[PDB]
Structures are given as structure tokens and as C-alpha cells.
Write a protein that binds this ligand. Sequence first.
Ligand code: NDP
Ligand code: TOP
Length: 165
Amino acid sequence: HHHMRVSFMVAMDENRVIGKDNNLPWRLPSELQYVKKTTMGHPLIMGRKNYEAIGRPLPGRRNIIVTRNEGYHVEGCEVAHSVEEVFELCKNEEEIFIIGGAQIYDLFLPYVDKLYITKIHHAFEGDTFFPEMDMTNWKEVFVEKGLTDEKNPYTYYYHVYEKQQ
Ligand SMILES: NC(=O)C1=CN([C@@H]2O[C@H](COP(=O)(O)OP(=O)(O)OC[C@H]3O[C@@H](n4cnc5c(N)ncnc54)[C@H](OP(=O)(O)O)[C@@H]3O)[C@@H](O)[C@H]2O)C=CC1
Ligand SMILES: COc1cc(Cc2cnc(N)nc2N)cc(OC)c1OC
């Protein structure tokens, strides 16, 4: 029904870990820069827990926080309380990025068209995971080696998938 492209933006390890104790288990500033470059201009949709672990809105974008809390407000961020209310807020957007966490990924899982998954070649201790997906009708269209250096001490790859339907 909706008219915007729904895209997932995720970074996960070898066992699909995405978080430990409300934190990225890894420090990869270059990966975060890729996320900034890829999502520039477009709304960011994130769960309340994902937002609070991030701490502040991030400029040049509509930041949309998903919560059941009817009285939740954050300076310079928009609040939505359901998938449909996000779809409302984003009705004239060309593309929106679902940036986590796990519960918010589950929430939009039936709607995802495009998949930006950074795969990190390491097995981290973690408590939150990227959900399993039926990859039937999905095609990998892009893969590139991420920057490994002193500041970014792991091997990782940018993968993109498009749903064929
Ligand atoms: N590497 C990666 O790709 C990323 C990692 N992460 C990590 O994952 C963790 C966050 O994921 P997780 O803990 O699952 O939390 P979420 O980010 O999914 O936030 C959960 C919150 O979303 C709100 N919510 C959930 N379902 C609904 C619903 N159906 N309707 C309305 N609101 C809803 C609730 O907010 P409320 O309680 O206020 O009502 C809930 O507490 C963090 O540790 C973070 O570091 C997150 C994103 C990306
Ligand atoms: C917008 O940048 C951030 C993004 C994330 C989550 C995240 C990080 N990387 C990828 N590829 N996808 C995601 N959903 C987490 C962050 O910190 C906890 C960020 O800022 C510091």
C-alpha cells in the first residue's frame, strides 16, 4: 500500500549479533561513515532502545523513534507508535531506512524491499540479533570490502540485497 522504498540498514557479525548490553560490540567509525553516506537525506526509523543507546538525533535527517509510550518526546525527533504511523509520517518520502534494533527489525520485516547488511568476520559476545530471513526472491546485487585499518580493526563487507517479489 505504502509508496516509499523500505530499506534495512544493519551491521551484524558471523552469528547475526547486532548488540551487546545496548552497545555495538565493535568500534568501526568507517562503517558508521558508510551508514551516514548511504542514508543522507532519508528518514531514519529506530526503536526507542536503539535511539537511547545512540543518545542524540543525527543531523540532516528525519529521525523517527518507535515506542508504545504515548508521552515520549525528544527535541528534534519525531515519534511514531506503530508501523502505520511511521508510514503516515513518511507518506511522501522516496525511501526510509530501518536502522534497528531487533524488535523494530521484526516489526518492519514484512515490508522490507532492500537490504544493506554489513557482515563482520568475527564472532562477538552479544545479546541482540538480526532476525532470520527467508532469502527466497532476494538477490545480492552489491558486495565490497570495508576499510580495515588501525582505527577499524576487523574484516567486514558491505552487502546489498534487493527483493524480486
Ligand atoms: N549493529 C546494528 O545493525 C544495530 C544494533 N542495535 C543494537 O540492538 C539493541 C536495540 O535493539 P532492541 O533492544 O531489540 O530494541 P529496539 O531498538 O527494537 O527498541 C525496542 C523498543 O521499541 C519500541 N517498540 C517495540 N515494538 C513496538 C511496537 N510494536 N509498537 C510500538 N513500539 C514498539 C518499544 O519502546 P518503548 O519501551 O519505549 O515503548 C521497545 O522498548 C541495542 O543494544 C543496540 O546497540 C540496534 C540497531 C542496529
Ligand atoms: C547512524 O549511525 C549509527 C547507527 C547504529 C546502528 C547501525 C550501524 N551500522 C549499520 N550498518 N546499521 C545500523 N543499523 C548505531 C549507532 O550507535 C550505537 C550509530 O551512531 C553512533
